[model samples]
Target: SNAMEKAKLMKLGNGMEIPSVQELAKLTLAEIPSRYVCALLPMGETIPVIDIENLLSPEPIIGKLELDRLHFACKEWGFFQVVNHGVDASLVDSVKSEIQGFFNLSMDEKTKYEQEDGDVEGFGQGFIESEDQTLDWADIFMMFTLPLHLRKPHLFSKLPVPLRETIESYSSEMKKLSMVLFNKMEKALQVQAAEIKGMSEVFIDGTQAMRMNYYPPCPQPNLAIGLTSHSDFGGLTILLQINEVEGLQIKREGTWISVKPLPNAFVVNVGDILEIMTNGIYHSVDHRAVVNSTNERLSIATFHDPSLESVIGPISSLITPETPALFKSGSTYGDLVEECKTRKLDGKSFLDSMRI
Candidate 1:
């Protein structure tokens, strides 16, 4: 019998009635409300993707002005794609090839490295459960990139041999870029770079995981999906690089916009933590991936986050007596990420949803 069937028969030693397969299945997916689902869905596959250069170049705008634009985009769209940020094109190609190569491994060879324990933290798919549930239509590898010396010793174990070195070198580059981006964001927000130092940690405190994803060509692509819709939890997320293949999408103006992969750019988005920090000044948007009928898709998503000890609350200066501060204190970054991961994946505010 399947795990669902087993969940139904899981009686206590005291002989109480247990959940049934139907009930378990509903608990897993169907019974979840759409409000929650919509919050998590990445249906932004139809919005117009303006060139990053248009937003940042011609040397007319000063750094402060550029940051203002960044802040505005985050507030309005909840996500932005960056170009000319300076990660090499060759490194980008190498990472893509590595992901493709990893997915290309033979089933037998791949299984040797496939994670049986989700807590093991290397490569695999689907949520971690006591018993295996239905598998997802994708495969993934994850790692922590910053504070590089403290990263997992086995970080590169699953990588294909030829691409391993390139990935490491590239990871180091991304770490530098992430820090640079964060510093610039601090300036853009009108705060000293040092003041925003803990922002990343507060956002990723609970479980800041990165996903190197692969969506294979599906015969019935629409029937299957690369990823379900969901908003990232935490302060902000810095996606390493998206290649030529297009699968990333975001919702805007009630329509989905395709996020085309630019040659040397990384996609950045506001996380739930940022919403709390900015007191809703910057919103976290919904985004997702769709499978192609004939073409396979692969990309790296590095979710930058803060440490658990970090306090996540709105900045007082950004609020006004007229604004009345959209949110209150007592909310934590871990609180939000857990709420989204174990239950709903919606982009809506948890505090707002609880009222009325």
Candidate 2:
């Protein structure tokens, strides 16, 4: 109760009521609600596609090129897809079934997991800080899963049987997957070394969480935003797009490109924390979800971030005559995460505030 009260107070800093969109969809109203509508954006070939096995293989004839490509991808797209990501393929099947199973639970059953008045974690929705905020045409279940101790017993331990079990291995695998990329990202950047700071110093014990998304088909798909446009405010995001429907689009340069999600592939992207840590060498590209008129879509986005205590800033060695540090040092990553929660998100919004 102590912790719950704290969370309640922490979030009382702001609040917004989320009408469960899934329930509204079930009503099958002839006219879509105006509140659910929003302005739309156009148009993706995709960012880049890399095979991780080739990069991590002991035989490095191809590893060199792939790592080079990774460096290029981060500097440019900041978003990419990885096939042969080390997560066991069978586990991927369970991960999908278990999450899909979650949404299928009856409304009464789902209510047990509904989000608290102002808190963002659970079976309903979040990222809505203002009552007047435009709605994202999607259902959400977000929960913090790692560093073990941070897991909310109310939300994490009380999960349905298989759901709880699947998340255990799933979060573990995602962490390993995150570290693999982090190692490569540091290798991608640290050919010129640093001792004072590096990815390892902050991310070895990372803050991890997952946000599962369900997008019900919209009658007027163009106007209803499946998810709002914003860059993720963390270290990395590993997204699984399942159910054979694609709604993710990345805003590049200044235009949107719809993605053709690869089957059994995890769409990975850099987030704002990485941009601050890398001193702008890596760009956290903007992306958002768009619903379709026909079939519903689903995705699971797992986020890995630096442990809350570290002050996230560009590494000392990364700054030099040629490339000065572009982002100012911050108090702690947890500060950034909590501070972002209290504000309304606009596209690629938070990172720019840190720029020098």
Candidate 3:
């Protein structure tokens, strides 16, 4: 049987009883099924860390050593934590507090901005096509915060005044930081800063989406997943952990390694588009979230993507006879996202379908 069929076995006649994996865990505490148990990597193993302060300096901020490290981390790990990233600490705190405040509101209040059947923005689970699908133990608030015209005034403007303000500010700040990181990434690949800047101009004016995730405490943490493993579908992602509650894990050399949170650091990950652009040189690795038995977890993820109309594929300048295109001629960002929506959130990525 498939994942959906397995999930159907847990459902009740009303279909509302098992709204999420958290509920499933509550019902099956003892003898939690083997399907959910993960073999975690050795406790001390951690993702790489890159300090961006030097990369942002006025005069040749990054040295060969630092550049090499950045390149290696992206190529091998597809994820890293960045410090001195220039986003204000106070702003980050405010954004987290505001998000928590929104989620803490009474359910009735939250329902005022509930996502409609065919929409993705607002308070709801994403892309739930069937009642029998296995669901993650998480709630989310998602919105398009860029390309001014794409903003959904009904949902965004309906948020509590404090939350609305904080989200707006946070989105702007993240956009700036994303561009800076992208520039550094281009340079790490031996591309000139000016050329990279010119190439990214279209993306700078493109789309960006932000999501706030809430993972509630689970009765049997080992039996439930907060989020299934998958690589992001965009160009890049900047994630902020609201608290120190550990749950995020990345697949590294066949081991599921935990990512420890660092204060004031943003966890950066390359997305499918970047992998394609780099001709598979830079990867978009698989990552997932597990739940905690007691404490809840919260995270805000900002996705930076190119224009829906822009074609994504291996950068022509980066491809030589030695490195012929690894991915077939790319598809539009909109097409990839549409394909992503059809996928089951079982750690499988949409990029697998785009490979040559």
Candidate 4:
């Protein structure tokens, strides 16, 4: 009756049967694999919540105490949520509504933007090299939304009219918010605010890619993973939760900690490039999504990264004899993008290969 059930009736090109999350859900707890069983941490009193208004203030927006908390969250959890971020509530609602409408379209309609072989953008799963590979219990629509020239106009233009307009406006707004966050991050590292603001303009502009993920209800919720555990490859991410279902989890102290969604706040996280730029002071966390048996979940994640030509590495000022560079020599954002595609999508990070 469900998509998973339908998948079980179908066979892949290699003649292997597709694993159905629904079927797995029907199995007893003892029958489930250990890898899929998650050990959840008890929700604490509260997670870190940053006030963007303070960060945007003229004088030392990030005070000593706030800066300490910001740095700790990045270094330890690599995730935090922010409020009063300047983006209009109406626009956020519009974007969510448009995306949901697009997802509800028929399969044939959604396939209009399907990715071609060897391409990362467009609607489809990230990477699938073989028919026997395990699949996540989720579907995604990804597209390059910045550096206008780099976008696939043909594919993006085919999206529903309302969704297209909403996405365009949302991308523009998020880009602005990203720069503010980036500047705050650099300041948190003791960098001069004026210099960081200028540098952010060059590096954080027009390097965004957005992914809308839909995790449908899985009959075997405990047996299926919505998204495999992994760290993001970009510099920063601004994630907007479209529904109340909580599936996002981050790895900490060898346990998976479920992130409680904050009302009208964006969950921001540091990515590999940001960690490298900060000279290992900040961390890029490994996180994943797990599905629920009865409810569907949706989220929009906008990645803010450096331009293709921008060289990525520890900032010269951030690196010293006392705190030497931890990553290999500077690499271009273009190179990292290529590497991310070729690397297998296991929970491990590809940036580990660049460690000194």
> Which candidate ranks first by lDDT, i.e. highest?
2
Q: Rate the local accuracy (lDDT) of all candidates.
A: 0.58, 0.81, 0.76, 0.76
Identify the runs in model 3 with alpha carbons over 4 angstroms from their true place: 1-44, 61-64, 114-117, 126-132, 192-199, 343-349
For model 1, residues 1-356, the per-residue Cα lDDT tens digits are: 46754444343232232122222222333232211122122343322233344434556565446667676676688887777666777877777777677666654454454443434455554333323122334566666655454356554565567766876777666665555555555555555435544343343223344677766554444554567666776655767544467888876776677777556667888776677677776787877787765566777787666654556676666667764577766645556556555765345456464322
Candidate 2 segments exceeding 4 Å error: 1-16, 39-41, 114-119, 126-131, 191-194, 342-348
lDDT by residue for model 3 over 157-230, one digit each (tens)? 68899888888888898899888877767777766646543336546887999988889877667666888877
Residue 340's lDDT in candidate 1:
51
RMSD in angstroms, candidate 2? 6.0
lDDT leaderboard ranking: 2, 3, 4, 1
Go through the candidates in order and give the C-alpha RMSD of each one to the true structure: 8.0, 6.0, 5.3, 4.4
Candidate 3 root-mean-square deviation in Å: 5.3
Q: Score residue 208 of candidate 2 by CA lDDT.
A: 93
* Ten-residue region with minimum lDDT total, candidate 4: 36-45
Which candidate tops TM-score? Answer: 2
Question: How do the predictions measure up, each by TM-score?
Answer: 0.72, 0.90, 0.85, 0.85
Model 4 / residue 53 / CA error / Å: 0.8
Model 4, global lDDT:
0.76
Would you give me the overall lDDT of model 1? 0.58
Q: How many residue pairs collide in each prediction?
A: 32, 4, 1, 1
